[PDB]
Each structure stands twice: as structure tokens, then as C-alpha cells.
Design a binder for this molecule. Structure first.
Ligand SMILES: Cc1cc2nc3c(=O)[nH]c(=O)nc-3n(C[C@H](O)[C@H](O)[C@H](O)COP(=O)(O)O)c2cc1C
Ligand SMILES: Cc1cc2nc3c(=O)[nH]c(=O)nc-3n(C[C@H](O)[C@H](O)[C@H](O)COP(=O)(O)O)c2cc1C
Ligand SMILES: [Mg+2]
Ligand SMILES: [Mg+2]
Lengths: 311, 311
């Protein structure tokens, strides 16, 4: 019942891991391949391997999570080499997603050039929103810089490309971003990355809970679902139909998934919940969503996709 | 134990209602005066009385609330007339706060000029962040427009003035705003107003829960505490000491209050929790905070104010 068509490809279901969660190593990736996830994406990579920020840098919270990982990853070449080899095995339905988060415009262009020249036939996700890199603000909050980068990207990148965006909180910002994005042959928009620079405090110790950036980190989980749903819906009613949407944020139950789909998301990514539960979450949430559909008499996501009703 | 000095005035405790909650009518205000709240603030007013947005426009949520009130208020003259008469009675310790949220720069300047010319001896709060006025984005997200307005304001406004700000999620934005604000003889910064344009969905009805703006509304409550604490802390380490801070967002228990104070807030405002519990909340939360202080051996807020520890 969850069969999904996205980026002109077929997926068994819309569920995926969110970049950064359970996708650091080849072992992690193979575990996602073995799970019931409809598709999976690699950890955002940089040209060179990164150790990331000092620990502790991730903490589970009652209402979600907080983190400042600092883009730890095994490097662009590691992930490219992996996806290229798996591609040749045709051992999975649906292409693999490849996330990149260059430390600079030049690095992003360099990696995109390499992907374009390689035989990679999967999907690429350009991360314009990492909120945990010291001294490096979220690019997608600089509309001018974002448009400038994308224009250069599309002068050469012809393969499927999506952009991971930070959350927006003003309708005019959605209008501005949509106008910018609609001018490009983008495959999709992924809303949203973590709510940036939040803070969690241990009242007993009177201190923060993560070491980097004086305790400031990206917030995920139940805390951000209202924002995530709003972003998915706001872009759904503004983006040209050629640009599909991946919904990310606060997805833990079939009900949460149902809500994102009702808003307009086609694919769904799970971050915090997956970090806590492991790959087994996919089998659980798929069953929860199917139960909701069965109760409503729905046999396909098309029966309710994007049909959220206004009052 | 909670005696507080703010804007050169003395308050019995730091607790107040958040503008917009339990402060619409004179009756509401008198109820706050009768409560244990250390101080209170009026509903943000406009030059003309406003009916606000269509109902339903406010809904209680398990993790907080969502709303799109649309600035319903009885008009500037109603509130000014009230505070002026109440001022003459000397029936309360600490000045009353007066919030204004003009529909335009001209409207804000007009109200500020009227306050300046009146005998009002209390504190004024300029709302630069209402996220529920259709076609009117949050001014504080337009740094240029914000600085331009404040420069004009301070060419004539000499009375205590604070600004209610929306939440920021990028450290560079805190830097930019702090630089702008530090050039003025501002009395305080109030962080934060609601997380803007969030969405809540009733999965059974497959629809939004508020009527205006297709269901998009300001999010308050537990959902936003991480963001609220971060904003209070980020400005505390960036603002010149002359500018104090009012912490607002996700305050429901003494522990939540303790956390805001630990971050650097001097006064504390309660929105969602007060909306749900009523003025009795002040008695409860004051006792909860005092119990926390007693267990830690603290006899004054100065014992921990702004002392949040980094790792
Ligand atoms: C530990 C951790 C690491 C993350 N790293 C990345 C990353 O490398 N690239 C990216 O686009 N998003 C990253 N994110 C953000 C997620 O992809 C997702 O957007 C966020 O957690 C919101 O979803 P959630 O509510 O399900 O957690 C990370 C999140 C977490 C919790
Ligand atoms: C029903 C309602 C009305 C509000 N109206 C105003 C307003 O007129 N002026 C203002 O500065 N903030 C207004 N706010 C926002 C609050 O002052 C406060 O910043 C927000 O609710 C975050 O605090 P909380 O987590 O305790 O609810 C309103 C909030 C609610 C829930
Ligand atoms: Mg599989
Ligand atoms: Mg009283």
C-alpha cells in the first residue's frame, strides 16, 4: 500500500533514515539496506574526512534530541566509492541518496563536479543547512548566497539533485525561497534539518549537556514536528509540481508519517527516532501507517497525499 | 528570596504574564494585579480596536499551544487610559508594562509619541515579532528595517523601552541583532515570542486545528523551551550590561524558571501555561522555584543568575 514514485524512481515505501543518523559507515549503510526502509541516504560528506566536534555532542531528550556533531564523516571518496560499487550489484529497489555538505561553496562545487563525472546514477542531496559547524552559518538563511550557488551548480549538474533546508518561520521567507528554487530543474526539497542552535540544561548540575558551542545544538524530535509539518506544507503549496518534497522532522509513529504525507511530503526521513530505536523502527512505523490507512479504507498514499484540509 | 531589580525598579518576584495572555481587558489586568505575579503587561495594542482573526484561533496542545489570534485588542487609548489611572493609585509594587504592536512603522511611532507625551511612568514593550498578522511578516527578521525604526524611535523616546523579539536560530543573527541593539539606550530585550508559523494537524479529521492562515500559527509551550533558553542565553552573552533580559517561552514549572534565570533572564513571562492554569499559576511556580533554591541553599536569584555552566 505504501508503494511510492519519487524522482522518477520506484520505492517500496516512503521511509528513509535522515542524513546523519545510522549512515556513517558502510556497516551502518548495509544495516539500512537490510532494514524495511524504502530508501536510505549517506551521512553528509566533506572533501576530507572529519572527526567532528568534541564529546559529548549528542544527547537523547524526553521530547527529542540535541546535538552538535560537527559533520563527522569518512570523506567524500569513501561514500562515492561505496555507492558506485553497490550500484553495480543491483541488490536493491530504488537508488541510494548521496548527501554532501561542503565546508565552502568551492567544496560543494568540487564534489558535485565529481559526482557528475562519476557513473553515479543515484540521487544527490545538497545540504544547505548544517547548524553545527562553528563559524559557518546555515547557507539557506542567506537567500542571495543560496541563489548564487544554485545558479552555478545548474550550469553543469544534470543528475537528480535535492536540497536539505533549515526551517523557516515567516511566510515571506517561504515565498522568497520558492521563487528562487522554482527557477531550477531541482528534483526535490527536503524540509527540515534541525531547529538550529537550541539549548538544553541540566538544572541539577546547572550546566549545558553538550560540549561544543557552549551547549548550543540542533533540536530534533517531538519538539520540531509543528515546524517541520509547516515547512513541508508551505513549500508544497508554493513549489512547482516538478519539485517534490521529502518530509523530515518529528517522525516517530505512523500518525506522524500520515501527517507529513497529508501535508505534501512524498518521501519521509527519520532522524531522532531512528537514532534511539535502530533500523527496527522501519518495520514498526510501516505497520502503524498501514493500520491507519486500513482504518480509513485507503489502499494507496495517493488517497490522501497532500489533502490536508483547511478550516 | 525572589526580590528582583529590573529597569531600575523593584519587583517582589520576576514572574509576569506574557503579553497576549490574560491581559485583554481591565478585568483581566486587575486579576493579574491581584495574583502573586511580580508584574504584568498589557495585551499588545494597535491604534484602533481590533476583533482579531476568525475562530477557532487558539488550541491547547499536549506539548504547548498553537494560535493565530490576529492581535485582537481594545485599542491604544483603552490601555493608556487604564495604566494612567492605575498609576495614580500607587496600589502596586513595580510599574506596569505596556505593549504596543503597530500595524506599521507609522503606527508604532504614533503610539510611542503618545506614550512619551503622556504622564505614563511605567515600562513600554515594542513588539517587533507578532507572527499572526496576515500579510505582515515579523519585523525583527528584517535587520535593516528594525534598525531604521529604532533609530527614529530613540530620537524622541526617553522612557523605559524594551523590545519583544522573535526567536533566532543562527549565531550570526544574534551577532547582527546585538550590534544593532547595543547602539541604543534600550532598557531590555524580551526573548522570545512564539516560534512562528508552525502547524498542528488532527489526523482523524485530516485537517488543521485553527481557521486563520490555513492552520499556520505561533507555537508556544514545551515545544519551544530549547529555543527560548538559547535566545535568552545568546543575547545575555552579547548585549551590553545596560540592556537586561526578560525570558519568555516554555515556562511552566519552577525548574523551567530556574533554567531561564540561569541563562541570564531577569524577569520571566508565562504565556501558554498561564492560559491553561489561570493566575493561580504564579503562586504555584513561585513556591516551586523557592523550593529549588532552598534545596541548593540559595537565598537570592543573584546566587545563580546567569551562571549557566559550559562543559
Ligand atoms: C546525530 C544527528 C546528526 C545529523 N547530521 C545531519 C547531516 O549530516 N546532514 C543532514 O542533512 N542532516 C543531519 N541531521 C539532521 C537530520 O537529518 C534531521 O533533519 C533532524 O534530526 C530532524 O529530524 P528528526 O526530528 O527525526 O530528528 C542530523 C541529526 C542528528 C540527530
Ligand atoms: C493566545 C496568545 C496570544 C499572544 N499574543 C501576544 C501579543 O499580543 N504580544 C506579544 O508580544 N506576544 C504575544 N504572544 C506570545 C507570548 O507573549 C509568548 O511570547 C509565547 O506564547 C511564548 O511563551 P509560552 O511558551 O509561555 O507560551 C501570545 C501568545 C498566545 C499563546
Ligand atoms: Mg531493505
Ligand atoms: Mg499582586
Amino acid at each position: 500500500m505504501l508503494n511510492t514514485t519519487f524522482a522518477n524512481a520506484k520505492f517500496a515505501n516512503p521511509f528513509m533514515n535522515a542524513s546523519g543518523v545510522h549512515c556513517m559507515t558502510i556497516e551502518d549503510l548495509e544495516e539500512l539496506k537490510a532494514s524495511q526502509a524504502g530508501a536510505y541516504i549517506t551521512k553528509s560528506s566533506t572533501l576530507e574526512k572529519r572527526e567532528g566536534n568534541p564529546l559529548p555532542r549528542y544527547v537523547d531528550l524526553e521530547l527529542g534530541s540535541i546535538n552538535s556533531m560537527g559533520l563527522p564523516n569518512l570523506g567524500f571518496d569513501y561514500y562515492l566509492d561505496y555507492v558506485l560499487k553497490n550500484q553495480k550489484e543491483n541488490a536493491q529497489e530504488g537508488p541510494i541518496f548521496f548527501s554532501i555538505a561542503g565546508m565552502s561553496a568551492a567544496e560543494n562545487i568540487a564534489m558535485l563536479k565529481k559526482i557528475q563525472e562519476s557513473d553515479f546514477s543515484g540521487i544527490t542531496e545538497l545540504n544547505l543547512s548544517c547548524p553545527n559547524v562553528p563559524g559557518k552559518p546555515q547557507l539557506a538563511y542567506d537567500f542571495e548566497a543560496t541563489e548564487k550557488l544554485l545558479k552555478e551548480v545548474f550550469t553543469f549538474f544534470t543528475k537528480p539533485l535535492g536540497v536539505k533546508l533549515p526551517p523557516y518561520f515567516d511566510l515571506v521567507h517561504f515565498d522568497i525561497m520558492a521563487e528562487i528554487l522554482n527557477q531550477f530543474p531541482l528534483t526535490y526539497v527536503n524540509s527540515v534539518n534541525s531547529i538550529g542552535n537550541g539549548l538544553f540544561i541540566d538544572p541539577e548540575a546547572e550546566s549545558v549537556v553538550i560540549k561544543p558551542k557552549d551547549g548550543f545544538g540542533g533540536i530534533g524530535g517531538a519538539y520540531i514536528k509543528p515546524t517541520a509539518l509547516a515547512n513541508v506544507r508551505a513549500f508544497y503549496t508554493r513549489l512547482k509540481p516538478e519539485i517534490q518534497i521529502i518530509g523530515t522532522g518529528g517522525i516517530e509513529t505512523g500518525q506522524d508519517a500520515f501527517e507529513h504525507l497529508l501535508c505534501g511530503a512524498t518521501m519521509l526521513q527519520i532522524g531522532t527516532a531512528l537514532h534511539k530505536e535502530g533500523p527496527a523502527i522501519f518495520d514498526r512505523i510501516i505497520k502503524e501507517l498501514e493500520e491507519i490507512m486500513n482504518q480509513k479504507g485507503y489502499q494507496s498514499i495517493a488517497d490522501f497525499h497532500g489533502k490536508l484540509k483547511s478550516l
